[PDB]
Symmetry: D2
């Protein structure tokens, strides 16, 4: 080991140690433990607009009760929405099943907190991050990378590498006990059949009973919308308009939003009433092993429909093709924690400039249950869709004549003959089966 | 002009002329007109398992009443399903809107009839095809290519290039009159606000009122399913199991199908009861102008869900990535009429072999209305999804340790520093905006 | 036909007609003919820095002798070099044979003259271009597109569609005669075994004897360099330094160039003395038929070596991969005449910004004959190549330890087992042949 | 730590340990040391047709002198050539500088020895490989993967993790001393300013003085060819013919080769006399850090020219595009040690079937010095290059007319107008700079 080794396996006694303080059991016990053992902890709670968080202000207050040197709320909502919109603009979603898309809400979230919490730590003179992200997940890598990109002098302390931490804490029962012995009644929540990670872009549910592919969405109580699959849940058809100005979502139902955070919060409400955007995916972790999740993203799903519809009516085939190619590649880079790397920047800026800036328009749709919806109208001054330009009603307005089309067809013949000749060559070399045959099963070569 | 000139602008009097005889007004009047003018027409009606065709046998019988020299039914169902399954296996679908996919059912249909009807014509000594496909659509090019690939000596007569055809026929009122004057009361079907093309893979609706983006699925009476968007339409939730064996769909609801045509007919019934698979798309025609359609494909949509789900649980990330890249490229080639060209064969065979052959398994789902469904179970002996291999419960079974993961992280540092340095270089050259700023809007460079 | 039909098949008598006046036989005879027949011709001669053009000023003077209403020289050199540099920066070259690259000098040239000559015509109130580009080449399409993009009201008159032009002119002997009968002794050049098209980016040789693949570079007298393959040609080894600043070539042999045109002219001289950059290619024309050429581009070949070398020492693997992917796609768009279309802009700007702006450095090489050269040095403050950062000499400076690498390897096991299991599955389904076998040829399944 | 832990940090005393015995100082001392310490070593020497190996038979004989339990020569030449030919067919080369290509000869070599030596070990009941491949290179990962794919029960002992090995051996002086103390005067070869790895596909030189980019090919004494850059080296121009049959190289200079190993040995001799194929590359290692090499591959370079030339004359543009796209992706997978993984198989088989099987023909060239050569002839019954099919000499043979081409142009107008309108939209949103300007530098927005 040396001075520039990033990972610290032992608690840095007497030093300032930053903690991404969500206020759950793990971070609460860790913070208390770090103080007890001699470190000086600084708590940073990310305000991510979590749909299941009732009161962010209460969290720093508990950090101080547990002995934090300082505790603050870092507002990450604006950035989260801006990165979410950038991902949307670039179609940066690589996880999908028969078209149903996962909007990479977890990786976007990590890109935001990994950079913003480390920067907040740096401003307070905190160059050590006591990051509990586990050895078997994706976040250990994402946070490692985002952290070091933000603060080159960052050291990362991994408590689970410290035998004293493993012995005194460990499982949830031991951590819950450690809290109680220090005089803090940690209000243990009612246990669920899965784990949840959330932010205002979306929520992901996985692990525990969701590890079995025989279980699924039926066991999930959604936190950003209703259980649309249950008959007792009454959902009436609802018309919605979504308006974009140069790629930025600016209005919902004719109401203009100067604040994009407020706009996404309203998109979330609209999609949420219908259960729009939920999916079930098997994803490939960074370590090359699969995991399974149930996902929610009602607001982004709503915006995705409108943005895509406009893209298909505004951009040419090659542009749409590059957009989709770039997006799948960018999605994977995002998932790996490389959202700010040069290769990702290239893909991202290309979409923000040449694809998104032309997207000025409005899409009208009807939402019913889950992903059942209908398109009602699509409007844009930038549309290239124009059946009137294809009108052959008058000879004076027709773009081309029947004779012109025949001329175009004649240009295909040379390559057609080349292809037919390839087919015959492929039969002779045994790659393709001959055209003609027998009326009964036949003997092969 | 030249002996190898494909297009004939004049009726070839006294010669054998093939007609793709659907039996609608256009082909009925054309066939009668061609006979009256001296040509010898041969009618070929493609049995495509059309969902709106009540009796295929009656069509050749009418061709003979109109003076056809001969009239045959060419059974294209087996081939249509085989090509549909190949497309499915290769994810050869390039037209989509926010994930909702068009299954290229029209282009697959043309690849089958364009080759099979021309081959049937050749057997009867017919080397001229009186093809009415219009000068402004995609099919004129698709049929031109498929036809010439099948029969190098094929000539194509386009009635609309013949001034005598334009003068005597033309609009539907003139054709309907021509029928009546020849003693045939052509029972014209009730007029619709759109045109429909169909086969057992799917149905497409476009033109007329569907040209307006302010109109949509609401004006369409579906022919392969119910009007799922109307509240008065009662749809009961339904559980379905779909089983694949080495990429081929072999069973539905535990019932094994030796005949793939019968299997797709049942898949169509199941999906049809729910309205599964309908979408609204703006597509890019071969001529680089956009058109709009409302699409149906209930059976293929059902199979796509199952196939995709299995692919995500069986194949590694690079394999899935190549599969999807190849599919979007292949979809476009298919749409262009290049399904049998070498570049298409490459993409297609790759999927049929290395992607599809590993797809042995069964997916269980619940269908509700439209594209609202839930996954209930996923089973396969070929799954690489395996949370038990990730289990750290025993030291003797864990694939890696916490210390091993730290080792992996340390391997990232060199490139992380390179990326951070790129970011600083990009700020200096003015490509990226600086990190730090002011509390109020600031003057830029 | 209608008012917005671009192509005019008849000479527009009494109207202003622009001619891209190169001053060769075709344009000289056409200009004279157009005046004689009543049109009012305006001549525009592109100054392209042609290596075989001794005096551009003399050309407009001849246009006026032939009866041009006006004649001017449009300087296209600055733009030609800027577009050439942009292509270079984006590696926009899709035609190559075993790595030997064609720098798309003809298509770049057409993008420049097609836009610039049409703009010059517009400023003089000339909205008709009498473009002689032939019906069987690529340029007819390129000029059509570039012209209409530049001037939406442009009409293009194609003399070869005019029966009066075909009758009075036609072959070279007839045109040469037409000149003589009008009192102009057109000084007919000594005939060559091939046709040449050139500009300061490069020169292309094709047609006539070069149509035979049994002929090649041996019959070509190069115009931008020496015949390096001939023993009588003495070529001494020469050291050269090429320096870039943020992607722009700025110095050669320590001499800084404020004018990029002068820099390329010197690069051409340096590469030309050695015959650097020549190649033999079979390309695919827009009409899907092949053509063959012998190419020269000594200056661009020199710059390409230096730029590429720097790219490989500065950018990460993913960045280089996107750069090369984008370049091959962009090259094809360029060749089609779509250099200014949105899909091309995307690819081009991406390279100019994220790839090229980091390319600040200097490459030293030794040129011998043809493409035989050696790299002597590569320097750049932006290099990520840094063997000293990989030095394990001191424990205090090593980036990772041996134990760290072992940790990284353990992360591969799960996918390795999945791959081995796929291999066994592929043998069972018959896709792959088993590993073990017999000592003699064996019977198959 | 775990029964399936691959890496062994301690010498397995009393157990059978396989050693890839090249017979250099490192493997000689290691083998002797392992025996002395109680292990039972089995030596396997790969016959790779190394250009610098004078006598393979002498190596096993020395292994036995040093105390090997058994020592065998495993003939890897046939497989090496077959994998080399497969790579060639698929253009699986991703490392290049201005077109000059590195033929991935080291990674191909590792794929062959990593699998073949492990299989040979298994036959002898040896399930432990004492692999000295270092902690900072690529081969540690390649061998790890190839080994485990071949033998799932393989354990890999890394001597450098054993403190007893580090203490007693270590540097070359210590190993050379250990040999002498055991009674073996190891005749150390003359020291070089770089390290070399070789096989009959090619040779790579790197490390030591080649780490400096100010040094290069000038300090290398080539082992597969002459020092073509030195004037004193006399090289006579030489004509060569290379013939392929369905993608397999079968003849050189009219002499047919039934044995591909013999064919490559002759190709190596021909290219070697000229120094054909040498290059200087900066590559990206698996660990995301760069390294520099000087490479030789005269035989493969010769075959690459012929294969590529034939590909350009036989295959259509889309086919060539897919071929090159697939190749760059496959090259990277090959470099990573994933040559036998599913995603690599897909790319590889596609080329072997649809690209290579059509490559039947012969290319004639003249080789001079280094990469300076000329193409003299290209012949193939499969060529699609055919200027006679483009001949407009007779009206009865012309594929299209001038009027037909005009028809084709008219089909471009709609998209041209869409693109022009995009350009105006991009100026309005500030993405593109306006067309018109001032005669002097102007104030911007
Ligand atoms: N036409 C296309 N060609 C290749 N890849 C495409 C295309 N369209 C979209 N993609 C996407 O490219 C991704 C990776 O490049 C794939 O996941 C695929 O979905
Ligand atoms: N890694 C890669 N994957 C795919 N295509 C690539 C890669 N590198 C370069 N290319 C280029 O992409 C082009 C078209 O996309 C091909 O002509 C090919 O040369």
């Amino acid at each position: 080991s040396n001075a520039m080794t990033t990972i610290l396996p032992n608690l840095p006694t007497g030093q300032k140690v930053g903690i991404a303080f969500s206020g759950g059991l793990d971070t609460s016990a860790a913070l208390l433990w770090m103080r007890q053992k001699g470190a000086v902890p600084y708590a940073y709670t990310a305000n991510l607009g979590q749909p299941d968080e009732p009161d962010y202000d209460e969290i720093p207050r508990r950090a101080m009760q547990y002995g934090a040197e300082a505790a603050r709320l870092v507002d990450c909502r604006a950035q989260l929405v801006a990165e979410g919109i950038a991902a949307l603009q670039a179609g940066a979603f690589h996880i999908s099943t028969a078209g149903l898309t996962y909007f990479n809400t977890t990786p976007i979230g990590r890109a935001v907190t990994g950079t913003m919490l480390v920067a907040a730590m740096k401003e307070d003179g905190v160059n050590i991050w006591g990051d509990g992200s586990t050895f078997k997940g994706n976040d250990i890598e994402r946070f490692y990378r985002y952290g070091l990109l933000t603060n080159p002098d960052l050291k990362i302390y991994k408590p689970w590498l410290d035998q004293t931490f493993i012995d005194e804490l460990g499982g949830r029962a031991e951590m819950s006990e450690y809290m109680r012995q220090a005089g803090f009644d940690y209000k243990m929540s009612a246990e669920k059949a899965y784990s949840t990670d959330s932010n205002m872009l979306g929520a992901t549910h996985e692990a525990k009973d969701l590890e079995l592919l025989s279980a699924g969405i039926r066991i999930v109580q959604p936190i950003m919308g209703v259980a649309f699959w249950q008959d007792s849940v009454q959902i009436k058809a609802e018309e919605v308009t979504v308006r974009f100005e140069e790629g930025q979502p600016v209005a919902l139902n004719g109401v203009e939003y100067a604040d994009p955070v407020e706009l996404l919060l309203e998109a979330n409400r609209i999609g949420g009433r219908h259960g729009l955007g939920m999916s079930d995916q098997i994803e490939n972790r960074i370590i090359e092993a699969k995991s399974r999740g149930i996902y929610e993203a009602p607001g982004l799903a709503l915006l995705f429909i409108a943005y895509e519809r406009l893209v298909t009516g505004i951009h040419n085939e090659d542009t749409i093709e590059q957009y989709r190619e770039n997006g799948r590649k960018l999605g994977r880079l995002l998932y790996q924690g490389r959202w700010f790397d040069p290769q990702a920047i290239m893909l991202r800026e290309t979409a923000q400039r040449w694809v998104a800036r032309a997207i000025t328009g409005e899409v009208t749709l009807e939402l019913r249950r889950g992903n059942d919806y209908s398109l009602l109208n699509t409007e844009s001054a930038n549309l290239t869709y124009a059946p009137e330009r294809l009108s052959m009603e008058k000879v004076e307005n027709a773009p081309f004549t029947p004779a012109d089309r025949i001329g175009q067809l004649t240009m295909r013949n040379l390559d057609i003959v080349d292809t037919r000749e390839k087919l015959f060559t492929y039969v002779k070399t045994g790659l393709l089966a001959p055209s003609a045959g027998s009326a009964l099963p036949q003997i092969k070569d």
